[PDB]
Amino acid sequence: GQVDKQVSTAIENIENKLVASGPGVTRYLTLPQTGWTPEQIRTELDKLANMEHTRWEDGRVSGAVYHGGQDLLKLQTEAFGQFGVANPIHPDVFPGVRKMEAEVVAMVLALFNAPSDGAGVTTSGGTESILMACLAARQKAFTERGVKEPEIIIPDTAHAAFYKACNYFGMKLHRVPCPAPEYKVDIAAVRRLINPNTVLLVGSAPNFPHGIVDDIPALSRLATKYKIPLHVDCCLGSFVIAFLKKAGFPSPYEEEGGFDFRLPGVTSISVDTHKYGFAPKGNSVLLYRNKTYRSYQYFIYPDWSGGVYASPSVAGSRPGALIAGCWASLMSVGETGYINSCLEIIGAAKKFEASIKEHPVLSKNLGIVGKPMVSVVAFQSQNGAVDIYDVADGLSAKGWHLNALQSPPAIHVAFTIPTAAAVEKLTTDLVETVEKELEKAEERKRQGKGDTSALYGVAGSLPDKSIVSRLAEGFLDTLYKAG
Amino acid sequence: VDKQVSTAIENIENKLVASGPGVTRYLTLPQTGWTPEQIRTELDKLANMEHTRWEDGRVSGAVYHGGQDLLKLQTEAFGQFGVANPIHPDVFPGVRKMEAEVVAMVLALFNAPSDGAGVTTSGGTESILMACLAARQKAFTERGVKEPEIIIPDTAHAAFYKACNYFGMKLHRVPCPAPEYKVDIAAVRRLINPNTVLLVGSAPNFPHGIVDDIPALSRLATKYKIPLHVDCCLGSFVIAFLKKAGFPSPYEEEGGFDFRLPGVTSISVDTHKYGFAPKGNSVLLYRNKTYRSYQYFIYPDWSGGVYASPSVAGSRPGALIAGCWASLMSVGETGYINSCLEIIGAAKKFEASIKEHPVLSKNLGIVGKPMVSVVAFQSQNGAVDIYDVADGLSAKGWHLNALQSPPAIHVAFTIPTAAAVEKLTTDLVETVEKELEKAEERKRQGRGDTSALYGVAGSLPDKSIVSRLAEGFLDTLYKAG
Structure with a gap:
């Protein structure tokens, strides 16, 4: 029962998080009786395009949009x-x-x-x-x-x-x-x-x-x-x-x-x-x-x-x-283009990597996972007071969509032309996030003693995987839920 | 066998790979990015390479609509x-x-x-x-x-x-x-x-x-x-x-x-x-x-x-x-009903043509009782080899589908092909007529057509042969240099 109820709740949360409802949400669940007009369609499509979403445009999503450049997009479109x-x-x-x-x-x-x-x-x-x-x-x-x-x-x-x-x-x-x-x-x-x-x-x-x-x-x-x-x-x-x-x-x-x-x-x-x-x-x-x-x-x-x-x-x-x-x-990018983009992306990666290793706060609390050479930087907690998943949720609350890992518990950033432009901001927000958790720990100690991302932590540590299994199954169902 | 195969493949390559003066083959990334205009230019060139004219409704079930208005919308x-x-x-x-x-x-x-x-x-x-x-x-x-x-x-x-x-x-x-x-x-x-x-x-x-x-x-x-x-x-x-x-x-x-x-x-x-x-x-x-x-x-x-x-x-x-x-959303129920009307109409018309037209009715026969957009017909006359008909239509610029069991051809009707049904019927009649004449000269005295080789290979004991033939095709698909 309880497992079930918890699951159902979690799923409901997912659905409530992904399925966009509310006044204005017109759900088209059957073919229109008469063809819409080109302008009608364009309108609706713009409407869709401008739904609220993690602003990849603001370079806040890890390895989802690699270029995103209007000029190129146009060309592809043509x-x-x-x-x-x-x-x-x-x-x-x-x-x-x-x-x-x-x-x-x-x-x-x-x-x-x-x-x-x-x-x-x-x-x-x-x-x-x-x-x-x-x-x-x-x-x-x-x-x-x-x-x-x-x-x-x-x-x-x-x-x-x-x-x-x-x-x-x-x-x-x-x-x-x-x-x-x-x-x-x-x-x-x-x-x-x-x-x-x-x-x-x-x-x-x-x-x-x-x-x-x-x-x-x-x-x-x-x-x-x-x-x-x-x-x-x-x-x-x-x-x-x-x-x-x-x-x-x-x-x-x-x-x-x-x-x-x-x-x-x-x-x-x-x-x-x-x-x-x-x-x-x-x-x-x-x-x-x-x-x-x-x-x-x-x-x-x-x-x-x-x-x-x-x-x-x-x-x-x-x-x-x-x-x-x-x-x-x-053909449009060409060798030069790719070299350039490489320069930027890898530059950003390296800068971030340095930041983690050098920044007085971060260098104490976090640690790089291995020796990454390319566009992906993964970091984990080296301080038991700072739970990496908590950091993840902290960044998420700041509008970041980074990748949470399991073995070991860590977060990674896959740098793309967008994210490379936001590396500094990422660094800043990370610092702040970390500080906060340290204070929490301080407050915990002061008090003498709600963890999210537990799905990847607590649930990640859960004995059976059936739980996460059902959780994902829900996710996927949600993906196709319109009614 | 090997030599025959190799020849066949060479023919395929020589029939799919566009070579010849002006064919620029880009086998490595350009050193400096091309300009939008350069790309557009090339792309137009590519788009206007010679090809079976689906636009003229001559290709079976490859392009179903092809309507500029829709294409634009999709593009947007x-x-x-x-x-x-x-x-x-x-x-x-x-x-x-x-x-x-x-x-x-x-x-x-x-x-x-x-x-x-x-x-x-x-x-x-x-x-x-x-x-x-x-x-x-x-x-x-x-x-x-x-x-x-x-x-x-x-x-x-x-x-x-x-x-x-x-x-x-x-x-x-x-x-x-x-x-x-x-x-x-x-x-x-x-x-x-x-x-x-x-x-x-x-x-x-x-x-x-x-x-x-x-x-x-x-x-x-x-x-x-x-x-x-x-x-x-x-x-x-x-x-x-x-x-x-x-x-x-x-x-x-x-x-x-x-x-x-x-x-x-x-x-x-x-x-x-x-x-x-x-x-x-x-x-x-x-x-x-x-x-x-x-x-x-x-x-x-x-x-x-x-x-x-x-x-x-x-x-x-x-x-x-x-x-x-x-x-x-753009097509809608009405649209689909209309397109259905047209496509199925055309199919039925074609089917009728085959059954009624003095020539065709005598020489060809519908395969089963089609009710949808696919019309398949076969030879009812040993003088007319269906594959030969196929090659005949092919020579007239038609890209129809050649079948095996039994030997037949099919047309899968699309908004384009529906607009060409008549022309298809005409060209088919003319094609048939030709083969009949051929058989006349044949019988009056006593080669290998492509589709026929397809039929012969399919009639061969082992499929290994056709298999290799296909492999070649696929390889060709990715041959640039």
């Missing part, structure tokens, strides 16, 4: 306008799109020093990329090594999409710890888990939670040695991780052959053109060391009454409009 | 919601709303129950995948099934195979025999076993545009307590508005083909076909939230925080969502 009806599955009908796509891939292959037989596909997103990589490896190991009970070895810090992959394609997952202070995968632990049913090694460049780049060289050595495909999740490093050297920022493992196709064990890399490529959402690229590989992810069904069906990825039908958007984005 | 929506990502509802509430509303509107269209739930997917493929996954997870959680099986009609969409391949399920193909080209209910029944986790039905099916016996499937589904999924991807809005338009509604008098039938647990609908939403916009419908839930992915233990996603994709395009939404 591209969309020109290729609105384009569907690449019909290259003979939409050749332009087909070209643009190919080119996008090419351009990315180059960024990561791909071999000449390098091949790649566009995917809707990093999730899809990862899925397809996994599938690829599975099919590979099946066709070649006749493997039937597939296994993949991932770091704990690895992106959940991998678990999704294993869940979907029926693979056994192995999570290796990334212990402090390095917060990098345990190579020995990886080695130990390698067995004949291992079909994929995974590495992160960097990883979502902490923004740490795993020991891709070491993983490559293992991969080469045991003849197992290495996949690099670079979704989040995107362009930024690549332009690091050009920007002058140290490139992860430069002196050990980098983190990309330069390393012979690296067989597949996933890159999100929509994160730091600044492409429209719905634009990622998966790279394979050779066509031979890529092929495993293809779906061909020749016996179909409707004709031979062939699809390179998950989707049959896709949006040429978005493809074109991605393309132009790349 | 995209412009306003370019950066929107629904996974952040607190950041992009509008999108979150619009989505929910879309789902609702569709749920209504198919007479969903009050506890009816639904998600948006990128497309019908994804819808189908998610339905299959849902069923699987259901049967696992509830009936502890470990070796899942699904029963589908032969005419069912390949995405089902993809689903089974992906999620490791056993697939059962049931025949759809002439003249009905509907699934064999008896054969379905016989295959039902404790490991059966999903029954499938088509409304209509892609190849022949036939609606399966959804009532019967519903009965079986209720009886054996197995989920029924209706693939409605291709019936989309048009099948929903058929009766309103005045055209007969499949199985009206037996409770229709949608949630009115108690056995119908899930329906997949493509807002991007006849909803006229931008590409990347489909909806999956479930009789109850409880059901829908099975397709959700929740990973709570993740160091980055509790991950939860409703479908395949984590990140998604709010721009597209908003576009789809507006499309609906």
Whole structure:
């Protein structure tokens, strides 16, 4: 009962927090009987656009909007306008799109020093990329090594999409710890888990939670040695991780052959053109060391009454409009653009990182998680008087949308062109937030002795996960609740 | 074999990859960003590359509306919601709303129950995948099934195979025999076993545009307590508005083909076909939230925080969502009824033409009894090879769909193609006539046409051949240099 009531309450709170109601909220739950007018639609749409929301425009949201620049957005919009009806599955009908796509891939292959037989596909997103990589490896190991009970070895810090992959394609997952202070995968632990049913090694460049780049060289050595495909999740490093050297920022493992196709064990890399490529959402690229590989992810069904069906990825039908958007984005930004943006973003990251380490308050109370090199800075509490989640809620109350982590308890900022412009303000607000909690503790001690974010703390520590499970289930339901 | 293959592939590449003077191939990022005007210029160039003229209504079921007014609106929506990502509802509430509303509107269209739930997917493929996954997870959680099986009609969409391949399920193909080209209910029944986790039905099916016996499937589904999924991807809005338009509604008098039938647990609908939403916009419908839930992915233990996603994709395009939404609102019931009237009208007209026109009626035959937007016809004359007809129309600039079982061609009518039905009829007549003449000279004395090679390869003992051929195609799709 009680658990139930608590849950229901929590859900109700979520719904009350996400579902926007109140006078003015017209809920359109059935098709209009007569078509609205263009102006009508435009009006309503503006109305929607101006709903109250975390002001990403004010650079207060972590890694949600990477560029946001009107000029670019317009361009993307025009591209969309020109290729609105384009569907690449019909290259003979939409050749332009087909070209643009190919080119996008090419351009990315180059960024990561791909071999000449390098091949790649566009995917809707990093999730899809990862899925397809996994599938690829599975099919590979099946066709070649006749493997039937597939296994993949991932770091704990690895992106959940991998678990999704294993869940979907029926693979056994192995999570290796990334212990402090390095917060990098345990190579020995990886080695130990390698067995004949291992079909994929995974590495992160960097990883979502902490923004740490795993020991891709070491993983490559293992991969080469045991003849197992290495996949690099670079979704989040995107362009930024690549332009690091050009920007002058140290490139992860430069002196050990980098983190990309330069390393012979690296067989597949996933890159999100929509994160730091600044492409429209719905634009990622998966790279394979050779066509031979890529092929495993293809779906061909020749016996179909409707004709031979062939699809390179998950989707049959896709949006040429978005493809074109991605393309132009790349062309409009260009090497210079990316170097510049890199400079800014990484600069901001480094500045923040310094702030935490140096600022008299922060340096005493907080600590950086590992040694982040890219665009993601994760920090945790080094003072038992300051609960990190409390800090999170404190910043949230100040209008910040940062990312709360679990293992360990921490917060991360994924810096984007917007957030980079707000770094100082972030620093300020963080200082103030921290101070406040210190006073609270002081007041607690004075008194002798309400914690929010407990969902990630108390609930994070809760014995069963069923609780958080139901909580999320609600969230998701809410996402589609209109009535 | 190898040489033949390689040649074929080379022909494909030489037929899809535009080369030749002026074809600038950008294989690396420009060193300095291009200017807006430069980009616009290039983009126009790309847009005006030579291609099958869908604008002239010569492409089957690729562009459903294509109307400038709508496109502009969609474009504006995209412009306003370019950066929107629904996974952040607190950041992009509008999108979150619009989505929910879309789902609702569709749920209504198919007479969903009050506890009816639904998600948006990128497309019908994804819808189908998610339905299959849902069923699987259901049967696992509830009936502890470990070796899942699904029963589908032969005419069912390949995405089902993809689903089974992906999620490791056993697939059962049931025949759809002439003249009905509907699934064999008896054969379905016989295959039902404790490991059966999903029954499938088509409304209509892609190849022949036939609606399966959804009532019967519903009965079986209720009886054996197995989920029924209706693939409605291709019936989309048009099948929903058929009766309103005045055209007969499949199985009206037996409770229709949608949630009115108690056995119908899930329906997949493509807002991007006849909803006229931008590409990347489909909806999956479930009789109850409880059901829908099975397709959700929740990973709570993740160091980055509790991950939860409703479908395949984590990140998604709010721009597209908003576009789809507006499309609906801008078109409205009236609009859809009108478009239905036109499209179905055209289909029927074509169907009649084939049955009545002195030439065609003698040489061709409709496949089954189509009622929707897909009209499929085959050769009734051994002198006329359907694929040859296909190639003939192809030479006339038509992009129609060539089928295998049986050998046939289909037209999926869209606002464009509907406007060209007459011209299509004319060109078809002329095409047929030609092949008849050819056969005359043939018989008077005693080669290989492309489509024929497609048929020959499909008639070959092993599919490995065609497989490779397809692979090549796909590779081509990503060849830039």
